[PDB]
Amino acid sequence: DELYREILLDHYQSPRNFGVLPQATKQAGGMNPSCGDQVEVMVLLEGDTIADIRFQGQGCAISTASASLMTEAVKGKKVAEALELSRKFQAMVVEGAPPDPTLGDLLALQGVAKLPARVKCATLAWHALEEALR
Amino acid sequence: VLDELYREILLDHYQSPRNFGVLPQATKQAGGMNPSCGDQVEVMVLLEGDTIADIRFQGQGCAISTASASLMTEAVKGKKVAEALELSRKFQAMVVEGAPPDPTLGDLLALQGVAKLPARVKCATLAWHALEEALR
Amino acid sequence: SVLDELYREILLDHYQSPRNFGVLPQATKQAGGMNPSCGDQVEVMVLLEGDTIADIRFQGQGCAISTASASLMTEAVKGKKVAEALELSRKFQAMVVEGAPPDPTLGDLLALQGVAKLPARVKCATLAWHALEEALR
Amino acid sequence: MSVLDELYREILLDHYQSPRNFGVLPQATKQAGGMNPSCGDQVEVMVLLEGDTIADIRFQGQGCAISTASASLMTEAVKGKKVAEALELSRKFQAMVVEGAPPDPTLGDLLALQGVAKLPARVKCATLAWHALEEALR
Amino acid sequence: MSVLDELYREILLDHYQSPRNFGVLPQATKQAGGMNPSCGDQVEVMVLLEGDTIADIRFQGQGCAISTASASLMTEAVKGKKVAEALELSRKFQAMVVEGAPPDPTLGDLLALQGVAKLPARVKCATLAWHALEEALR
Ligand SMILES: [Zn+2]
Ligand SMILES: [Zn+2]
Ligand SMILES: [Zn+2]
Ligand SMILES: [Zn+2]
Ligand SMILES: [Zn+2]
């Protein structure tokens, strides 16, 4: 709908779930020395569900929007279902895999496939998440 | 241009969704969840007789479900329950079926493009199904 | 082409933030319009300090075109002589209804020039103007 | 540039929506008016002069987005400048919009209206506020 | 060319309208001013040094949208970095906009100004803040 341009802008300027989790079950950071992106993901698990999740860090607009979108994409889902969006998303931008409708707002970051130099900027948050949920 | 205006309508509603929130003394509420996208919604309405005196929606999902929910509450607020149902059928005929858009849909016509996006049709109709469920 | 798409932005801006939206208690005259085609409704109120349209505002719920049109309408008419407003009304209708070459004198109104290609939406744009014409007398 | 052309468009839109220095100016040293009936634009420029410098300036009127944005951008470009300087900027501005000549960066945000050179029927919409300024300073 | 283009335009607009680290830096260790004699852009960069680390940095000035956005983006890019890392960024930024070199990925959000390279006469509006930074750090 090309309104995905707004999704990117919205999340870049108003990142969701940005901050610290008082009580967290899992936590893992990530960093990109080159661009200067850094993100730490905190997660609260209840059973096999991501009860709450938040991120912290600074970096380019792409990494900030990606972290925001990722937190919104997995909150309330099961760890398994979360790891599936991760592997998938990494496909949309790393291997240039084909788009997937079940990614919803995450689609807004397809173009990252192009300009493979910034792919690192978009997967930082997802790597941190997987390192947390493992 | 029509295409330019519809794009702008969807953006405006995604950015500033109308009637977002909760109704304190809601006559009847109803919730809804999406299987293919995982969109979740809940609609609350205040009825004075058979007129939707007020309505509100909350929850969240993709941009489409939010814009569609906003446009929906805007179109039915203050309207007769029967009118809300009339708009709902017209909307679904447009989005679900390839049916030629009913001109009385107004700004809801901006979501016409979803008709050619299955797996995304449920993102648009979620709010409407919850509304119907809320109106009994 | 920084300007080549300015009209679209002007139009989109008026849809988003329509001007003179509200009411004018004690308006010299008022008039309402409605086209069941799209389901639009409009209320026009004007301040006639004699022969000039001092202030003006519009009410009613309708689609984006009806909203933008009535917005662009009030901005193009406020503070102008009654006759001047009607002159613009004719020029505007000539543009959207008859699809005639838009009169450059229309200024910002040219933002709606594309409506001439939309038979099903012509009344959406002209509604605010017909209401204006009924009020102004 | 594309990204830059869009930044400029945003600048124009901003000045269109919220023009700067818009309104009457108390103690105005002088003021001049201008009309561009070809479009239906009208503008009034008022200046407060102190020596050879424009201490303050404002404009009023109504018209297309281009003329209003040109008026707003013009007030911001000359406020606090030397009368001769303002006139110099007006020279360069009209040279860009009327002669399509290569505009130097000393026009700054005014460069947003550079494309008007390719739009003969809009040149007067852009130059109106400046002719008024010049007449208000003469 | 349009996904990030859209985002880049937004970044520029946002930094120009709401520049970051804009104000006087009281505890400034060193500072330097830069000026584009013609465009009228002026900037002053103040840095608070702790060892070889730029602990804080702020800028002051007035000018065109490009110069403001650039100064804003520059302060964000170098705050918290070592002096040598800031000078490298400056070198890369100038290679991008002055030499038109293949934009170095490490520039991040600064890549939003890559397009200024296509407008030679406006390149000085983008580099002004960086020259002031370098002078302050010398
Ligand atoms: Zn990055
Ligand atoms: Zn959805
Ligand atoms: Zn209509
Ligand atoms: Zn004009
Ligand atoms: Zn400059």
Side-chain angles (χ1 to χ4, degrees):
Chain A
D1 257 299
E2 288 169 292
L3 60 68
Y4 290 120
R5 273 184 167 70
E6 276 311 272
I7 290 178
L8 275 182
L9 169 60
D10 188 8
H11 287 268
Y12 147 57
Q13 300 185 179
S14 306
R16 276 59 153 173
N17 309 303
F18 182 66
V20 184
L21 280 179
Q23 127 226 54
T25 303
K26 306 281 192 166
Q27 194 181 306
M31 219 172 107
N32 205 316
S34 32
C35 183
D37 312 319
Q38 173 193 294
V39 62
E40 67 163 357
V41 174
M42 298 176 82
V43 181
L44 172 72
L45 304 176
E46 303 193 319
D48 281 1
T49 305
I50 298 177
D52 210 327
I53 176 177
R54 297 182 183 171
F55 81 94
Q56 280 189 287
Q58 29 82 77
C60 56
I62 300 171
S63 68
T64 299
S66 194
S68 180
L69 284 164
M70 175 283 282
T71 65
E72 280 224 301
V74 307
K75 184 185 278 179
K77 308 293 169 54
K78 297 77 185 72
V79 174
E81 311 188 313
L83 293 176
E84 262 305 291
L85 286 168
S86 183
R87 182 188 57 59
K88 287 187 177 185
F89 179 88
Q90 276 156 109
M92 196 178 47
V93 318
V94 161
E95 310 300 7
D100 198 321
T102 60
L103 286 172
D105 292 356
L106 296 182
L107 300 166
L109 281 172
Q110 289 197 61
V112 184
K114 301 159 185 177
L115 303 83
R118 305 189 58 52
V119 164
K120 242 68 174 182
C121 281
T123 68
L124 187 64
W126 287 96
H127 286 303
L129 180 70
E130 293 189 302
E131 183 171 60
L133 302 170
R134 287 165 189 289
Chain B
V1 186
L2 204 58
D3 297 67
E4 312 176 322
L5 282 171
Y6 288 166
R7 297 196 182 77
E8 204 57 32
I9 289 178
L10 294 185
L11 304 182
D12 169 37
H13 281 283
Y14 162 70
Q15 292 298 307
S16 307
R18 283 60 153 171
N19 313 106
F20 184 90
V22 183
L23 276 180
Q25 315 295 302
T27 299
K28 180 173 178 178
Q29 175 176 174
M33 277 131 248
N34 197 55
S36 62
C37 186
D39 293 313
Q40 192 175 306
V41 193
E42 72 171 63
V43 173
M44 306 172 80
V45 307
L46 170 64
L47 311 181
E48 279 178 49
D50 65 322
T51 293
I52 295 180
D54 185 27
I55 182 172
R56 302 280 195 182
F57 84 94
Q58 55 178 174
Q60 192 178 301
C62 64
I64 296 182
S65 55
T66 297
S68 179
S70 180
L71 277 156
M72 188 215 75
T73 55
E74 183 177 65
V76 305
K77 190 179 197 304
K79 297 291 192 298
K80 279 284 191 168
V81 174
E83 300 185 70
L85 290 181
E86 288 285 306
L87 279 166
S88 186
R89 185 193 68 76
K90 291 173 178 177
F91 182 80
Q92 298 183 59
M94 170 190 73
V95 177
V96 183
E97 318 158 11
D102 188 315
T104 53
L105 276 171
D107 283 349
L108 287 168
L109 290 168
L111 285 169
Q112 200 194 319
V114 183
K116 272 49 192 172
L117 292 172
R120 229 59 213 297
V121 173
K122 304 231 178 181
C123 300
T125 71
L126 186 58
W128 290 93
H129 295 316
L131 170 60
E132 283 174 23
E133 289 302 303
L135 301 172
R136 298 172 184 288
Chain C
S1 178
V2 170
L3 303 163
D4 220 303
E5 308 190 67
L6 175 52
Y7 275 129
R8 175 179 177 176
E9 305 296 327
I10 294 174
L11 180 53
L12 300 180
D13 174 47
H14 275 274
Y15 151 53
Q16 176 60 56
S17 310
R19 281 59 153 169
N20 304 85
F21 185 74
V23 183
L24 300 170
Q26 290 343 303
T28 312
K29 43 259 296 183
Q30 188 184 322
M34 60 297 99
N35 64 151
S37 177
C38 188
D40 302 313
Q41 302 176 297
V42 183
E43 307 182 3
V44 175
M45 302 158 262
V46 296
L47 267 57
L48 292 187
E49 274 179 344
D51 47 64
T52 298
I53 302 177
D55 207 1
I56 178 180
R57 304 220 196 308
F58 75 97
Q59 280 288 179
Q61 306 201 305
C63 64
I65 294 178
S66 183
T67 298
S69 187
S71 178
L72 286 169
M73 185 282 268
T74 52
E75 280 221 300
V77 166
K78 186 195 300 182
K80 316 307 181 65
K81 289 277 188 170
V82 179
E84 299 185 300
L86 301 179
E87 291 284 306
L88 283 166
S89 186
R90 186 193 67 72
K91 297 172 184 178
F92 183 86
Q93 298 176 211
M95 170 179 71
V96 302
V97 183
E98 283 94 21
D103 189 312
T105 295
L106 283 169
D108 281 345
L109 300 181
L110 300 176
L112 289 172
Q113 149 160 44
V115 178
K117 175 56 185 173
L118 310 177
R121 305 302 284 279
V122 171
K123 290 186 177 180
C124 295
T126 58
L127 193 61
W129 291 94
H130 283 132
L132 172 61
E133 284 188 34
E134 285 190 55
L136 285 176
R137 277 201 287 178
Chain D
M1 195 278 280
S2 193
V3 173
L4 284 180
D5 280 357
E6 306 207 305
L7 169 64
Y8 282 151
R9 187 160 61 215
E10 290 294 345
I11 292 177
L12 290 190
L13 295 176
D14 181 19
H15 282 270
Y16 163 53
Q17 284 175 285
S18 315
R20 282 60 162 170
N21 306 121
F22 183 66
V24 309
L25 180 62
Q27 284 175 286
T29 292
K30 183 180 174 182
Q31 69 188 68
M35 264 270 235
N36 175 46
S38 173
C39 182
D41 307 314
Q42 187 221 74
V43 64
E44 306 297 304
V45 174
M46 298 155 279
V47 304
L48 196 168
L49 297 166
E50 292 172 356
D52 58 314
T53 299
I54 299 177
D56 202 359
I57 176 177
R58 303 225 189 305
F59 82 97
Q60 289 195 303
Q62 19 203 55
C64 60
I66 293 184
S67 71
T68 297
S70 192
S72 179
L73 284 168
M74 182 218 80
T75 58
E76 289 211 306
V78 308
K79 187 195 291 179
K81 297 292 182 181
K82 300 291 182 57
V83 178
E85 293 183 298
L87 295 176
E88 186 48 46
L89 254 167
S90 185
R91 215 255 89 185
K92 305 175 187 175
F93 181 73
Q94 299 177 62
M96 171 186 84
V97 178
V98 181
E99 303 173 63
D104 58 52
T106 89
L107 278 176
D109 291 349
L110 290 171
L111 292 181
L113 296 167
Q114 166 174 41
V116 172
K118 291 182 291 192
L119 301 181
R122 302 310 297 290
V123 173
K124 285 188 177 180
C125 291
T127 63
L128 190 68
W130 295 85
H131 290 142
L133 169 66
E134 288 190 44
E135 184 183 302
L137 298 183
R138 289 182 179 183
Chain E
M1 183 176 102
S2 249
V3 134
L4 273 176
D5 183 342
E6 160 65 28
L7 183 48
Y8 284 172
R9 175 194 73 205
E10 293 303 341
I11 290 173
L12 293 189
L13 180 62
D14 185 15
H15 277 271
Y16 134 63
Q17 287 175 166
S18 302
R20 280 57 159 171
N21 308 298
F22 188 71
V24 174
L25 185 66
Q27 295 73 46
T29 312
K30 304 174 185 180
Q31 61 287 129
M35 195 172 286
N36 274 166
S38 55
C39 188
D41 307 325
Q42 61 176 181
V43 68
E44 172 174 31
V45 174
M46 297 146 279
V47 300
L48 165 58
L49 300 176
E50 291 180 1
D52 61 350
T53 292
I54 296 177
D56 203 352
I57 175 175
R58 292 180 187 164
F59 83 96
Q60 285 285 264
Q62 316 268 64
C64 70
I66 295 169
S67 59
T68 301
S70 190
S72 182
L73 283 164
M74 174 279 282
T75 62
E76 287 206 310
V78 311
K79 194 192 289 182
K81 311 298 184 63
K82 288 190 178 182
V83 179
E85 303 173 305
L87 291 175
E88 267 296 276
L89 273 180
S90 182
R91 179 186 65 64
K92 295 185 176 71
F93 184 80
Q94 293 177 63
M96 170 180 77
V97 306
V98 183
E99 286 164 44
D104 191 313
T106 175
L107 290 172
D109 292 336
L110 295 174
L111 293 177
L113 289 164
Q114 154 175 40
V116 70
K118 296 299 182 180
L119 307 178
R122 301 166 188 61
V123 167
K124 56 180 132 289
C125 301
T127 66
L128 184 57
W130 290 94
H131 290 122
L133 176 70
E134 294 199 21
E135 186 187 314
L137 295 179
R138 297 307 170 61

Tab-separated table of all heavy atoms in Angstrom, chain E residues 16-57:
chain	number	residue	atom	x	y	z
E	16	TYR	N	16.239	19.509	10.409
E	16	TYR	CA	16.247	20.914	10.044
E	16	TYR	C	15.239	21.679	10.915
E	16	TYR	O	15.525	22.771	11.401
E	16	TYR	CB	15.926	21.038	8.547
E	16	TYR	CG	14.909	22.089	8.168
E	16	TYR	CD1	15.150	23.446	8.397
E	16	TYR	CD2	13.703	21.725	7.573
E	16	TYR	CE1	14.210	24.414	8.040
E	16	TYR	CE2	12.757	22.682	7.214
E	16	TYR	CZ	13.013	24.020	7.451
E	16	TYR	OH	12.071	24.960	7.101
E	17	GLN	N	14.071	21.083	11.129
E	17	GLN	CA	13.024	21.710	11.931
E	17	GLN	C	13.250	21.607	13.435
E	17	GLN	O	12.879	22.506	14.197
E	17	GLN	CB	11.667	21.100	11.562
E	17	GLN	CG	11.166	21.569	10.194
E	17	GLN	CD	9.876	20.891	9.759
E	17	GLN	OE1	9.213	21.342	8.823
E	17	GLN	NE2	9.518	19.802	10.432
E	18	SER	N	13.861	20.509	13.858
E	18	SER	CA	14.125	20.274	15.267
E	18	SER	C	15.573	19.821	15.428
E	18	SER	O	15.836	18.683	15.791
E	18	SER	CB	13.175	19.192	15.789
E	18	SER	OG	11.814	19.574	15.582
E	19	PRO	N	16.534	20.719	15.161
E	19	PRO	CA	17.938	20.317	15.296
E	19	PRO	C	18.317	19.845	16.695
E	19	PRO	O	17.903	20.431	17.704
E	19	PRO	CB	18.701	21.571	14.863
E	19	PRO	CG	17.799	22.681	15.306
E	19	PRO	CD	16.417	22.165	14.894
E	20	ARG	N	19.106	18.777	16.732
E	20	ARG	CA	19.582	18.181	17.969
E	20	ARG	C	20.816	18.917	18.455
E	20	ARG	O	21.553	19.488	17.652
E	20	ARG	CB	19.955	16.710	17.753
E	20	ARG	CG	18.789	15.725	17.743
E	20	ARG	CD	17.751	16.078	16.703
E	20	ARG	NE	16.940	14.912	16.355
E	20	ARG	CZ	15.853	14.954	15.596
E	20	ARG	NH1	15.425	16.107	15.103
E	20	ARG	NH2	15.208	13.834	15.308
E	21	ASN	N	21.030	18.887	19.768
E	21	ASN	CA	22.188	19.531	20.395
E	21	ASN	C	22.374	20.982	19.948
E	21	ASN	O	23.500	21.432	19.699
E	21	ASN	CB	23.445	18.718	20.083
E	21	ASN	CG	23.281	17.243	20.424
E	21	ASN	OD1	23.066	16.886	21.582
E	21	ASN	ND2	23.363	16.386	19.414
E	22	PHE	N	21.266	21.712	19.865
E	22	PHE	CA	21.299	23.107	19.456
E	22	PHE	C	21.223	23.993	20.703
E	22	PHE	O	20.204	24.012	21.390
E	22	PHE	CB	20.113	23.404	18.537
E	22	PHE	CG	20.158	24.762	17.922
E	22	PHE	CD1	21.084	25.060	16.929
E	22	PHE	CD2	19.285	25.757	18.342
E	22	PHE	CE1	21.139	26.332	16.361
E	22	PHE	CE2	19.335	27.030	17.779
E	22	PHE	CZ	20.265	27.315	16.787
E	23	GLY	N	22.309	24.711	20.988
E	23	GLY	CA	22.356	25.583	22.151
E	23	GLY	C	23.795	25.813	22.583
E	23	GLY	O	24.720	25.231	22.011
E	24	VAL	N	23.996	26.668	23.579
E	24	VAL	CA	25.339	26.925	24.080
E	24	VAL	C	25.777	25.786	25.002
E	24	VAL	O	24.975	25.274	25.784
E	24	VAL	CB	25.396	28.250	24.866
E	24	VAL	CG1	26.784	28.428	25.510
E	24	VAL	CG2	25.091	29.409	23.938
E	25	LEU	N	27.040	25.381	24.901
E	25	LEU	CA	27.590	24.325	25.764
E	25	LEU	C	28.503	25.033	26.764
E	25	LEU	O	29.650	25.333	26.454
E	25	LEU	CB	28.410	23.322	24.939
E	25	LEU	CG	28.966	22.092	25.663
E	25	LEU	CD1	27.816	21.183	26.127
E	25	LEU	CD2	29.880	21.330	24.713
E	26	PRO	N	28.008	25.282	27.987
E	26	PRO	CA	28.721	25.965	29.076
E	26	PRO	C	30.142	25.517	29.361
E	26	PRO	O	31.071	26.325	29.375
E	26	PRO	CB	27.812	25.733	30.289
E	26	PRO	CG	26.462	25.541	29.682
E	26	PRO	CD	26.759	24.685	28.492
E	27	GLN	N	30.295	24.225	29.594
E	27	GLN	CA	31.579	23.635	29.929
E	27	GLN	C	32.467	23.338	28.720
E	27	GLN	O	33.419	22.581	28.839
E	27	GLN	CB	31.352	22.330	30.698
E	27	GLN	CG	30.680	22.457	32.061
E	27	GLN	CD	29.198	22.790	31.979
E	27	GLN	OE1	28.456	22.190	31.203
E	27	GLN	NE2	28.759	23.742	32.797
E	28	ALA	N	32.159	23.929	27.569
E	28	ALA	CA	32.936	23.675	26.357
E	28	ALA	C	34.451	23.776	26.604
E	28	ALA	O	34.922	24.738	27.202
E	28	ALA	CB	32.515	24.651	25.254
E	29	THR	N	35.197	22.787	26.132
E	29	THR	CA	36.662	22.763	26.290
E	29	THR	C	37.285	23.593	25.165
E	29	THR	O	38.236	24.351	25.375
E	29	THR	CB	37.198	21.321	26.188
E	29	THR	OG1	36.406	20.467	27.025
E	29	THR	CG2	38.679	21.248	26.639
E	30	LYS	N	36.737	23.426	23.965
E	30	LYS	CA	37.194	24.143	22.787
E	30	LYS	C	35.967	24.438	21.943
E	30	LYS	O	34.905	23.854	22.149
E	30	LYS	CB	38.162	23.292	21.965
E	30	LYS	CG	39.372	22.774	22.731
E	30	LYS	CD	40.196	21.815	21.872
E	30	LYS	CE	41.338	21.203	22.667
E	30	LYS	NZ	42.158	20.250	21.859
E	31	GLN	N	36.124	25.344	20.988
E	31	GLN	CA	35.038	25.714	20.106
E	31	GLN	C	35.618	26.345	18.851
E	31	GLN	O	36.816	26.683	18.797
E	31	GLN	CB	34.088	26.707	20.797
E	31	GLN	CG	34.741	28.017	21.222
E	31	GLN	CD	35.656	27.856	22.421
E	31	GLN	OE1	36.817	28.294	22.398
E	31	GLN	NE2	35.145	27.237	23.480
E	32	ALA	N	34.768	26.486	17.838
E	32	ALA	CA	35.178	27.085	16.588
E	32	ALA	C	33.952	27.490	15.802
E	32	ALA	O	32.903	26.840	15.873
E	32	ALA	CB	36.034	26.108	15.783
E	33	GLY	N	34.087	28.588	15.073
E	33	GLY	CA	32.991	29.082	14.271
E	33	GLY	C	33.329	28.948	12.807
E	33	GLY	O	34.497	28.977	12.420
E	34	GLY	N	32.300	28.785	11.990
E	34	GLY	CA	32.498	28.656	10.566
E	34	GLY	C	31.482	29.546	9.892
E	34	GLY	O	30.397	29.781	10.430
E	35	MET	N	31.820	30.051	8.715
E	35	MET	CA	30.896	30.914	8.014
E	35	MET	C	30.969	30.772	6.498
E	35	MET	O	32.051	30.624	5.921
E	35	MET	CB	31.165	32.363	8.416
E	35	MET	CG	30.072	33.336	8.049
E	35	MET	SD	30.394	34.958	8.767
E	35	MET	CE	29.986	34.644	10.492
E	36	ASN	N	29.797	30.789	5.868
E	36	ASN	CA	29.667	30.728	4.413
E	36	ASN	C	29.378	32.200	4.130
E	36	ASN	O	28.224	32.625	4.170
E	36	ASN	CB	28.471	29.859	3.999
E	36	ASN	CG	28.811	28.378	3.908
E	36	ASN	OD1	27.919	27.529	3.839
E	36	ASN	ND2	30.100	28.063	3.890
E	37	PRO	N	30.428	32.996	3.853
E	37	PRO	CA	30.304	34.432	3.576
E	37	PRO	C	29.133	34.862	2.692
E	37	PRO	O	28.529	35.909	2.929
E	37	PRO	CB	31.657	34.762	2.951
E	37	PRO	CG	32.589	33.882	3.722
E	37	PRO	CD	31.830	32.565	3.728
E	38	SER	N	28.806	34.060	1.685
E	38	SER	CA	27.718	34.409	0.779
E	38	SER	C	26.341	33.895	1.202
E	38	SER	O	25.439	34.693	1.461
E	38	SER	CB	28.044	33.925	-0.639
E	38	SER	OG	28.327	32.538	-0.666
E	39	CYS	N	26.177	32.574	1.267
E	39	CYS	CA	24.890	31.991	1.648
E	39	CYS	C	24.391	32.579	2.961
E	39	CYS	O	23.192	32.566	3.241
E	39	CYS	CB	24.992	30.465	1.778
E	39	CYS	SG	23.393	29.600	2.014
E	40	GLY	N	25.314	33.099	3.763
E	40	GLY	CA	24.932	33.686	5.033
E	40	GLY	C	24.824	32.668	6.151
E	40	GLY	O	24.400	33.001	7.257
E	41	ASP	N	25.197	31.423	5.875
E	41	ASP	CA	25.131	30.405	6.909
E	41	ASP	C	26.286	30.619	7.876
E	41	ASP	O	27.405	30.934	7.468
E	41	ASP	CB	25.249	28.990	6.337
E	41	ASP	CG	24.252	28.706	5.228
E	41	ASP	OD1	23.106	29.200	5.280
E	41	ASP	OD2	24.622	27.954	4.306
E	42	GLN	N	25.998	30.458	9.158
E	42	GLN	CA	27.011	30.599	10.184
E	42	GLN	C	26.768	29.510	11.213
E	42	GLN	O	25.629	29.170	11.526
E	42	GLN	CB	26.935	31.978	10.839
E	42	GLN	CG	25.621	32.271	11.532
E	42	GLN	CD	25.635	33.611	12.247
E	42	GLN	OE1	24.650	34.000	12.874
E	42	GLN	NE2	26.754	34.323	12.156
E	43	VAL	N	27.847	28.946	11.723
E	43	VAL	CA	27.729	27.898	12.711
E	43	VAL	C	28.861	28.032	13.702
E	43	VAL	O	29.923	28.588	13.393
E	43	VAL	CB	27.810	26.496	12.050
E	43	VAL	CG1	29.216	26.261	11.499
E	43	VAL	CG2	27.451	25.406	13.056
E	44	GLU	N	28.607	27.567	14.910
E	44	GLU	CA	29.621	27.544	15.936
E	44	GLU	C	29.462	26.169	16.553
E	44	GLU	O	28.346	25.743	16.861
E	44	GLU	CB	29.416	28.619	17.006
E	44	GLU	CG	30.407	28.429	18.161
E	44	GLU	CD	30.366	29.531	19.197
E	44	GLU	OE1	29.283	30.121	19.408
E	44	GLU	OE2	31.423	29.789	19.819
E	45	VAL	N	30.569	25.461	16.676
E	45	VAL	CA	30.556	24.141	17.266
E	45	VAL	C	31.378	24.180	18.544
E	45	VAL	O	32.496	24.702	18.563
E	45	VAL	CB	31.125	23.103	16.286
E	45	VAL	CG1	31.252	21.747	16.974
E	45	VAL	CG2	30.192	23.001	15.051
E	46	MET	N	30.792	23.654	19.615
E	46	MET	CA	31.423	23.615	20.932
E	46	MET	C	31.523	22.172	21.364
E	46	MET	O	30.555	21.418	21.245
E	46	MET	CB	30.572	24.380	21.940
E	46	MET	CG	30.443	25.862	21.613
E	46	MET	SD	28.828	26.499	22.103
E	46	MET	CE	27.810	25.963	20.695
E	47	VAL	N	32.688	21.784	21.866
E	47	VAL	CA	32.905	20.414	22.291
E	47	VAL	C	33.411	20.359	23.724
E	47	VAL	O	34.196	21.209	24.150
E	47	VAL	CB	33.933	19.695	21.366
E	47	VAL	CG1	33.428	19.678	19.923
E	47	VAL	CG2	35.286	20.408	21.429
E	48	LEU	N	32.918	19.376	24.468
E	48	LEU	CA	33.333	19.155	25.844
E	48	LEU	C	34.177	17.899	25.745
E	48	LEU	O	33.677	16.835	25.377
E	48	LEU	CB	32.124	18.904	26.754
E	48	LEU	CG	32.388	18.304	28.146
E	48	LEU	CD1	33.335	19.207	28.947
E	48	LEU	CD2	31.065	18.125	28.881
E	49	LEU	N	35.461	18.025	26.044
E	49	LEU	CA	36.362	16.885	25.955
E	49	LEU	C	36.697	16.264	27.300
E	49	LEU	O	36.934	16.968	28.277
E	49	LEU	CB	37.679	17.296	25.278
E	49	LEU	CG	37.634	17.840	23.851
E	49	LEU	CD1	39.048	18.268	23.440
E	49	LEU	CD2	37.090	16.778	22.891
E	50	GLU	N	36.713	14.938	27.332
E	50	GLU	CA	37.084	14.185	28.524
E	50	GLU	C	38.078	13.153	27.997
E	50	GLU	O	37.699	12.103	27.470
E	50	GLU	CB	35.858	13.523	29.155
E	50	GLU	CG	34.903	14.539	29.780
E	50	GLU	CD	33.677	13.903	30.413
E	50	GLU	OE1	33.568	12.658	30.384
E	50	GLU	OE2	32.821	14.656	30.936
E	51	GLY	N	39.359	13.481	28.116
E	51	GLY	CA	40.385	12.597	27.604
E	51	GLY	C	40.386	12.848	26.112
E	51	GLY	O	40.468	13.995	25.679
E	52	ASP	N	40.286	11.794	25.316
E	52	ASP	CA	40.255	11.971	23.875
E	52	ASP	C	38.832	11.729	23.379
E	52	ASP	O	38.596	11.579	22.181
E	52	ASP	CB	41.226	11.005	23.191
E	52	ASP	CG	40.887	9.552	23.454
E	52	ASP	OD1	40.026	9.284	24.321
E	52	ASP	OD2	41.488	8.674	22.794
E	53	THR	N	37.887	11.696	24.315
E	53	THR	CA	36.487	11.460	23.982
E	53	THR	C	35.652	12.733	23.956
E	53	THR	O	35.750	13.569	24.858
E	53	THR	CB	35.832	10.489	24.987
E	53	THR	OG1	36.396	9.182	24.823
E	53	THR	CG2	34.324	10.413	24.764
E	54	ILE	N	34.830	12.866	22.919
E	54	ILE	CA	33.933	14.010	22.787
E	54	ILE	C	32.753	13.628	23.678
E	54	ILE	O	31.874	12.886	23.257
E	54	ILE	CB	33.453	14.183	21.325
E	54	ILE	CG1	34.647	14.496	20.420
E	54	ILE	CG2	32.412	15.303	21.240
E	54	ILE	CD1	34.296	14.622	18.939
E	55	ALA	N	32.780	14.101	24.922
E	55	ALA	CA	31.745	13.802	25.907
E	55	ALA	C	30.426	14.447	25.550
E	55	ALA	O	29.357	13.873	25.767
E	55	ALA	CB	32.191	14.269	27.296
E	56	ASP	N	30.497	15.663	25.028
E	56	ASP	CA	29.296	16.369	24.630
E	56	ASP	C	29.672	17.335	23.529
E	56	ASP	O	30.841	17.718	23.382
E	56	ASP	CB	28.678	17.121	25.819
E	56	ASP	CG	27.190	17.394	25.622
E	56	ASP	OD1	26.667	17.136	24.514
E	56	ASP	OD2	26.541	17.865	26.570
E	57	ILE	N	28.684	17.728	22.745
E	57	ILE	CA	28.937	18.638	21.645
E	57	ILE	C	27.646	19.340	21.305
E	57	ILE	O	26.582	18.723	21.334
E	57	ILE	CB	29.444	17.856	20.400
E	57	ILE	CG1	29.596	18.795	19.197
E	57	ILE	CG2	28.461	16.734	20.040
E	57	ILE	CD1	30.228	18.103	17.951
